[PDB]
Amino acid sequence: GITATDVISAVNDQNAQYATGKIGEEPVTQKSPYVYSITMQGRLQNPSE
Amino acid sequence: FENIILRTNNDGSFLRLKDVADVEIGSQQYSSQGRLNGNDAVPIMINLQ
């Protein structure tokens, strides 16, 4: 009972873009000794995925 | 941008973006502080065409 449109929206949603930010790069509310960053790869590389 | 309404309550009241965020006008120094002879100074770089 899966229509072809469900295939399109499932691929459109599970193969997303990317996401990146930093933790404490903007003006300090506390004296942080160093700042790190976070990433997120919402992209499928292998066909097995 | 501060009086944007988020939730409409069953009692007529309105929850707004001011009660949930702060809308500062760009700039955001202390992401890139400037200096001049030790004192704080905002620099403009005149790039030759």
From chain B, which residues contact A within 8 Å (Cβ)?
28-31
Structure tokens at B2: 């501060």
- Cβ of A26 within 8 Å of Cβ of B29? The answer is no
**How far is the C-alpha of B13 from the C-alpha of A1, rounded, in Å?**
44
- Cβ of A28 within 8 Å of Cβ of B30? The answer is yes
Please report, in angstroms and rounded to a whole number, the separation of the first and last CA atoms in chain A: 23
Q: Determined by which method?
A: X-ray
Structure tokens at B27: 């700039």
Q: Which of left, alpha, beta for A47 (phi over 0: left; psi -120 to 50: alpha)? A: alpha
Strand partners, A25: none
Sign of CA dihedral A6, A8, A14, A19: negative
- Cβ of A26 within 8 Å of Cβ of B30? The answer is yes
**How far is the C-alpha of A22 from the C-alpha of A40, rounded, in Å?**
12
Query: How close, in Å, is residue A39 to chain B by CA atoms?
Result: 20
* C-alpha pair distances (Å), A29 with each of A33, A38, A42, B7, B36: 12, 19, 31, 29, 25
Structure tokens at B8: 């409409």
Helix (H), strand (E) at residue A11: helix A4-14
**How far is the C-alpha of A26 from the C-alpha of A23, rounded, in Å?**
8
